Design a protein around this ligand. Structure first.
Ligand SMILES: O=P(O)(O)CP(=O)(O)OC[C@H]1O[C@@H](n2cnc3c(NCc4ccccc4)ncnc32)[C@H](O)[C@@H]1O
Ligand SMILES: O=P(O)(O)CP(=O)(O)OC[C@H]1O[C@@H](n2cnc3c(NCc4ccccc4)ncnc32)[C@H](O)[C@@H]1O
Ligand SMILES: [Ca+2]
Ligand SMILES: [Ca+2]
Ligand SMILES: [Zn+2]
Ligand SMILES: [Zn+2]
Ligand SMILES: [Zn+2]
Ligand SMILES: [Zn+2]
Lengths: 519, 519
């Protein structure tokens, strides 16, 4: 009878410091959460208590706050090394600054194995990257060994910039022979640690023979057993049990995002590495857990370089700028309207009138209680990808297809839900996918007084949108394929910063741009 | 058989210069209309042709452009004297600068009789004002005499600032004994010239025994016989015939507004002053009629003082700013939304969120074709009254009553139709007056993310509105009576000027703030 305690994080997205409850900047310290100094305190407390502990990360440490914009991964290596992570799997945002932005800051500086079994490197890169990441690592834990097999989303080429020299194979196809290899080496306890989403995690648990546990990320899945401690609503019980094809009960875990919770699963293994049982729950890293003074002091040393991005007040908001995924991927959110209003206002500085913006590109809210202040830092967490707001010419039929795409698989917190400007769209979700747009009115351009008229399929419209959408991101293949004209635009954060400075005080509202009908 | 040609103007509202087709500033001179130099040319041409001519004005020369803001009536006297008007009746806007603003600039300087039979002066004013205006004037016309009896809206106390020392009697009650007096003096041809609206004009024609003709104003009524020459749609035939209670066919005339048309009625009288017949039509004063070089040259001399209000460009519009009555008293107009958006933006510079604005207070459009320029002059014609945008606290029931008032007598081009900000109102005109508001949603204040929720009768709301409305103007007695708090605000034009300067380029749209339902 051998008990293993798995501590896990995922999709931390540069939340090195403690944050507000919604993962935005900490203002009121007495009610802040997460951060690596607080995470250190709980991890310490568990290592003291439990003899067999593994601290794992399921990817997406990269991208999210001014920390990454400035340290570009050097902070991830340093603070993950200080927390003494046992292993990390590569996520899609680890490739946002290319392979050289992964290699030099993180891979060459981590003191723990970084893992991906379905990433194969070819051409000139094959020689460089060899050994910097591994398909698995066999880790000594007490008197035993635990094998950890990594995996990264098959669709990382479409989500990031891994380059042409890396091949992302199907997770299951790539994992099975590595799991078999570990078994032939008598590694009888195997953890699949990776970054492909809860749905793939469940499939791996079902299909990859020999995997005892799956620790995932990518879908920001919150699982819980009992009454939850904060605003996140559970998608299922923690752990989520999958019965594999060979009949084993396989626990599947995920721990939301932003370092708000520490995943915690206790596994009771028998002497042959069979899972007899498991139990646990994500630990909310709230104000009650003190921040470790040593990590805190070191965070404060690294925080000095970032304070030049917090001194200049760009403007002021008198409203909560709702950039949460719970809003922005499900309904009209005022952060969306603000961003689309800045996009449109910038383009005129000629006239285009319409704006579409993927809800998933809104990576954070902004709080109004700090005397309403808005800084470059506040904005860098909302728009971290360094994209541009481009002008495009589209047929009405193309736009109808994009709005059908916006809600084709509604209800799953997917980033393709569009925020708009100069568009009044009505959806009926009782209708079949591809036929849910019941009204779509657009602001006229060939008119002296602008007003809303129904969209015409045979007409052409000028639309300002992120380059991510113009390139067919979030499955908007129809935009990239069918567009008639594409012009590169201005940097996304500079556009919003410029608008907020011109306005001085902002108060964007939810005003009926996107509605749902269920008569 | 004696023929009289009556030339008449009304509601000229300081359009001393020629204007665009919509009565806004002239930009493209080749298609401009009206103005006193062009009016002089047609009046001249008719005086040459016809031996018996009277040039009459039915009031409201005062208020409308930078001309009045600066010359305060001195320009009205000078250019009416140069046009050689035979008589003018007092309108309600002649009292906008009090009785001293009427007396000194216009009354003491006009070389023609200024008339009002239903205005009686009491107290200290009675001595001052005696003889400066008259109830009637008997005018020699060729070998005959024509009597002209004046009248001014009974409701001028509620519309302007005539003061407590002037009494406005019922028009019919005051006119009858003056008409009888003229008959006893064997004045057998009588014109009623006044400023009370087409509906009162028709009543006077019906009820005042001995009136041969009624020449009115105040309702900007356009009458025409045949196919009309411009965008104004006729309210009836020109002249409009009323059969009086004693059985006479009495012609009633009006000539729209802004000096765009010159009223023209030929009356065939018999030797006892009976009207045998009449005919005519308003003459459109378009580009084809040349501007008189002498009046034009004199207009250009007086235009130098006003050019300091045209040099500074406040901002720019890329949309036609529809401030027409045809829009703003009938539906959501983008000039209304712009003005309400400036009102709301100014008040925050705390937060209130809602705005109501009487459509009649929007006194002109602004054109975008002049490279989109907006000047103090452009704005002074939209907002000429020198009012303030005040903060008020109202019960929801009060606001419901105001929106019911907005459309209680819809379809008559009345100024009480409200333009809004932070309100989504739906009207159903098939319903009975006092019950046409089918939806009224308002932008929440006690919420972190503003959104539209139905108005509650028992709740209280903060509303920015013109002081004209806070004082119960346009019959909004419920606002003045029921309001819980009233704070004096900032000057109306300075508020809009400030907003346009902050925005640099404006593009207000018609966006569904006010809708009509007829399912
Ligand atoms: O993204 P996670 O893995 O954390 C999974 P999530 O569910 O929290 O968020 C998914 C959503 O984020 C959005 N997203 C993601 N990366 C985006 C991007 N650039 C990336 C990038 C490309 C190349 C070079 C550098 C940088 N630009 C715009 N939207 C993006 C997109 O809307 C997607 O549906
Ligand atoms: O007004 P006309 O006689 O030309 C008749 P119209 O049909 O063209 O316009 C009528 C509409 O104009 C509007 N109006 C009129 N005078 C207004 C005002 N101040 C006046 C004033 C009071 C006291 C001291 C100085 C100045 N403030 C605001 N709206 C006003 C009102 O909405 C009304 O229904
Ligand atoms: Ca096992
Ligand atoms: Ca007569
Ligand atoms: Zn992520
Ligand atoms: Zn991811
Ligand atoms: Zn008038
Ligand atoms: Zn009037």
């Amino acid at each position: 009878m051998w008990e293993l305690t798995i501590l896990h994080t995922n999709d931390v997205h540069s939340r090195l410091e403690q944050t507000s409850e919604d993962s935005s900047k900490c203002v009121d310290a007495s009610r802040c959460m997460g951060g690596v100094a607080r995470l250190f305190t709980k991890v310490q407390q568990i290592r003291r208590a439990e003899p067999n502990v593994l601290l794992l990360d399921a990817g997406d440490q990269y991208q999210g706050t001014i920390w990454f914009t400035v340290y570009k991964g050097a902070e991830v290596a340093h603070f993950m090394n200080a927390l003494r992570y046992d292993a990390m799997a590569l996520g899609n945002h680890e490739f946002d600054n290319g392979v050289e932005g992964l290699i030099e800051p993180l891979l060459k500086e981590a003191k723990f194995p970084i893992l991906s079994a379905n990433i194969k490197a070819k051409g000139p890169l094959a020689s460089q990257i060899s050994g910097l990441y591994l398909p698995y690592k066999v880790l000594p834990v007490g008197d035993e060994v635990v094998g950890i097999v990594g995996y990264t989303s098959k669709e990382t080429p479409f989500l990031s910039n891994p380059g042409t020299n890396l091949v992302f194979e199907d997770e299951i196809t790539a994992l099975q022979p590595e799991v078999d290899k570990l078994k032939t080496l008598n590694v009888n306890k195997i953890i699949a640690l990776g970054h492909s989403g809860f749905e793939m995690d469940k499939l791996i648990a079902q299909k990859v023979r020999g995997v005892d546990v799956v620790v995932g990320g990518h879908s920001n899945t919150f699982l819980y057993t009992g009454n939850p401690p904060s605003k996140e609503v559970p998608a299922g019980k923690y752990p989520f049990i999958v019965t594999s094809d060979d009949g084993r009960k396989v626990p599947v875990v995920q721990a939301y995002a932003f370092g708000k919770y520490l995943g915690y699963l206790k596994i009771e293994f028998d002497e042959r590495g069979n899972v007899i049982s498991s139990h646990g729950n994500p630990i909310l890293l709230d104000s009650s857990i003190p921040e470790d003074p040593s990590i805190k002091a070191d965070i404060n040393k690294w925080r000095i370089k970032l304070d030049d991005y917090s001194t200049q007040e760009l403007g002021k908001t008198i409203v909560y700028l709702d950039g949460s995924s719970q809003s922005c991927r499900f309904r009209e959110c005022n952060m969306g309207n603000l961003i689309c209003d800045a996009m449109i206002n910038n383009n005129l500085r000629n006239h285009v009138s319409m704006c579409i913006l993927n809800g998933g590109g809104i990576r954070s809210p902004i709080d109004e209680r700090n005397d309403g202040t808005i800084t470059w830092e506040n904005l860098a967490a909302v728009l971290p990808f360094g994209g541009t707001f481009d002008l495009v010419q589209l047929k009405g039929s193309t736009l109808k297809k994009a709005f059908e795409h916006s809600v084709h698989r509604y209800g799953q917190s997917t980033g393709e839900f569009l925020q708009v400007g100069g568009i009044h769209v009505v959806y009926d979700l009782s209708r079949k996918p591809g036929d849910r747009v019941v009204k779509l009115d657009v602001l006229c351009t060939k008119c002296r007084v602008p007003s809303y008229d129904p969209l015409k399929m045979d007409e052409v419209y000028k639309v300002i949108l992120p380059n991510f959408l113009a390139n067919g991101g979030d499955g908007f293949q129809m935009i990239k394929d069918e567009l008639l004209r594409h012009d590169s635009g201005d940097q996304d954060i500079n556009v919003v910063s410029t608008y907020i400075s011109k306005m001085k005080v902002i108060y964007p509202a939810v005003e009926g741009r996107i509605k749902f009908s269920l008569e």
